[PDB]
Write an enzyme that holds these catalytic residues in place. Structure first.
Site, PDB file in Angstrom:
ATOM      1  N   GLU A   1      47.903  40.959  33.124  1.00  0.00           N
ATOM      2  CA  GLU A   1      48.105  42.232  32.431  1.00  0.00           C
ATOM      3  C   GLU A   1      49.588  42.554  32.303  1.00  0.00           C
ATOM      4  OE1 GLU A   1      45.863  45.650  33.797  1.00  0.00           O
ATOM      5  OE2 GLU A   1      44.228  44.337  34.503  1.00  0.00           O
TER       6      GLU A   1
ATOM      7  N   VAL B   1      45.467  42.929  42.815  1.00  0.00           N
ATOM      8  CA  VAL B   1      45.492  41.594  42.246  1.00  0.00           C
ATOM      9  C   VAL B   1      44.845  40.478  43.067  1.00  0.00           C
ATOM     10  CG1 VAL B   1      47.597  42.246  41.092  1.00  0.00           C
ATOM     11  CG2 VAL B   1      47.710  41.010  43.236  1.00  0.00           C
TER      12      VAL B   1
ATOM     13  N   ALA C   1      33.170  38.649  40.023  1.00  0.00           N
ATOM     14  CA  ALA C   1      32.565  39.962  40.234  1.00  0.00           C
ATOM     15  C   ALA C   1      31.863  40.027  41.585  1.00  0.00           C
ATOM     16  CB  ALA C   1      31.586  40.283  39.106  1.00  0.00           C
TER      17      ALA C   1
ATOM     18  N   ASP D   1      49.106  44.708  56.981  1.00  0.00           N
ATOM     19  CA  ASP D   1      48.343  45.818  56.423  1.00  0.00           C
ATOM     20  C   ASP D   1      47.455  46.492  57.473  1.00  0.00           C
ATOM     21  OD1 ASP D   1      46.664  47.504  55.033  1.00  0.00           O
ATOM     22  OD2 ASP D   1      45.380  45.836  54.364  1.00  0.00           O
TER      23      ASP D   1
END
Ligand SMILES: [Zn+2]
Lengths: 321, 314
Positions: free
Chosen positions: A214, A27, A287, A55
């Site tokens: 979504e 996301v 994109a 992470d």
């Protein structure tokens, strides 16, 4: 009065000291962390900010295109933003390991093992992991001689990193029934409660959720928000990434994409009705891989002033290519 | 393992086929496709496609109107649809998991048998278009759930006092007997739903992080019920590399991402029949289209040669 669809008041806050940023799935959580960090830092030149990640993939390093580690380093190109990537669990193991060794040859709360109760009592591991992080920070502040005004926690992609906020109440319940270890537990419980003092104050700390428009992402976000509420942590913001306002775009021709947009529109509307009281900030699909200070700042701008698919299109297409 | 459902579609041994998948992953379309595929390849047998979703997904899918009573899909000889609402058609519910599920399921099994007794024609196989919510089949655990309970009472009741025990008057024993009768009902079905050759569950999902995560969870849950899981259909794949390169860097971008997880899926579910189904921009609706599309569940779709077929649907 309507709740502005932006993070302007947060990015502008002079009261917040801890901002947690999370979102499961692909996301755009990492880029959101960087964007919030940059936006805060550019808006408050007078203060110092720390953007920390857990992470192990070193998402921050590949996000900025620099190399960060256990030691804070200022982001190249900025005066008041630094990043540090660590691995609390690893350092905890190293530290615990040595403690076990000292036992066999006889955070002070480890002599021997308080870590064995981990796979038994929820949140002890997380509390220990977090305390490790808070330690690496203070040590960096003591050395560089300069303390950070605000810290942005790029939350870990897995687990329940901050379940420890429940630890205090989880122990009291246990300690009553059961009524060395006992002393380490009470010392830990006292440490998590001073943190809750901080992490539970709405003006001091908040959590911004990240998600895509979504079904599964919306339900995951609902889950996350309930959990944060159960910890008494503030949740007032939701960033919705990868939105392709195909409704009117440059080179906007693709019917498949138009179909996707129609879908996102569906849920974007559910999100708006469900989280009316929230700052629900819509962010454009871009994109590519928003990487490097320049692009990240150009894009992060839309967290402060809501994006306009009509007017601002030119800006994101200067990046998408 | 072959990337298709040919052996299932062709099975002469399966009586119950459950199809599920959370999110907008094309669950309904998948249910219809499996039902059609099965029906077309076994003209000799009668199939029942039943749904629970109050939205009437089946009616909207076929463009016909189905209800509580079975009706043959217009244009087919051995496939009928039935849309019911079990819940719509005894308060230990909000206390003991799977009791309501079991009750709801038994309702469904009852509307079916009564349809079979009236029409005089029994269905050879039933495809359950699972409900998009809850845990419709958690009742498979009820039997063990109860034994444990009707045992903790024996360790307590038989370990209390004549007064204390007898000092609890109210229609509860009016339950001890009905729980044992329900437990017996779920266990006879369990004998059916637990046999691999008799029942199986086909999962449906899209090649994305959250969907893989969710189907991972689904599979675990189904294994904990001892229900067979050997198939997973992956919908909405846009083989953009073969898309005659209809351009759109955004779509190509999406495809690369789907490719990443398609890969993980392959490596994680190697022993499974992982059927790849092409994205079909639109709403595959109506027998004809559903048939045309459903064919790729039987013989794997080929992005190169079969493209023309799915675009005659866009
Ligand atoms: Zn497109």
């Amino acid at each position: 009065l309507t709740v502005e669809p932006n993070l302007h008041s947060l990015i502008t806050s002079t009261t917040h000291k801890w901002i947690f940023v999370g979102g499961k799935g692909g996301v755009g959580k990492t880029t959101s962390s960087c964007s919030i960090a940059i936006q805060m830092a550019l808006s408050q030149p007078n203060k110092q900010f720390l953007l920390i990640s857990t992470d192990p993939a070193h998402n921050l390093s590949d996000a900025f295109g620099e190399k960060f580690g256990k030691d804070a380093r200022k982001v190249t190109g900025m005066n008041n933003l630094s990043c540090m990537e660590i691995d609390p669990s690893a350092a905890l193991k190293d530290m615990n390991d040595m403690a076990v060794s000292r036992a066999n040859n006889n955070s002070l709360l480890q002599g021997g093992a308080l870590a064995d109760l981990t796979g038994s009592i929820p949140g002890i591991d997380e509390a220990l992991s977090f305390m490790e992080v808070m330690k690496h920070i203070k040590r960096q502040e003591q050395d560089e001689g300069e303390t950070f005004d605000t810290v942005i926690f790029d939350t870990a992609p897995t687990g329940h990193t901050l379940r420890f906020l429940q630890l205090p109440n989880t122990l009291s319940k246990l300690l009553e029934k059961f009524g060395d270890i006992s002393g380490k537990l009470n010392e830990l419980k006292a440490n998590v409660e001073t943190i809750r003092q901080q992490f539970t104050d709405p003006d001091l700390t908040t959590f911004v959720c990240v998600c895509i428009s979504e079904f599964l992402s919306l339900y995951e976000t609902e889950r996350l928000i309930q959990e944060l509420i159960s910890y008494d942590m503030d949740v007032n913001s939701i960033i919705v990434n990868q939105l392709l306002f195909a409704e009117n775009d440059q080179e906007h021709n693709c019917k498949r994409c138009q179909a996707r947009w129609k879908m996102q529109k569906k849920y974007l509307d559910q999100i708006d009705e469900l989280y009316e009281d929230f700052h629900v900030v819509k962010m454009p699909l871009c994109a590519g891989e928003i990487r490097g200070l320049n692009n990240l700042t150009k894009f992060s701008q839309f967290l402060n002033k809501e994006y306009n698919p009509i007017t601002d299109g030119k800006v994101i297409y200067e990046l998408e290519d």
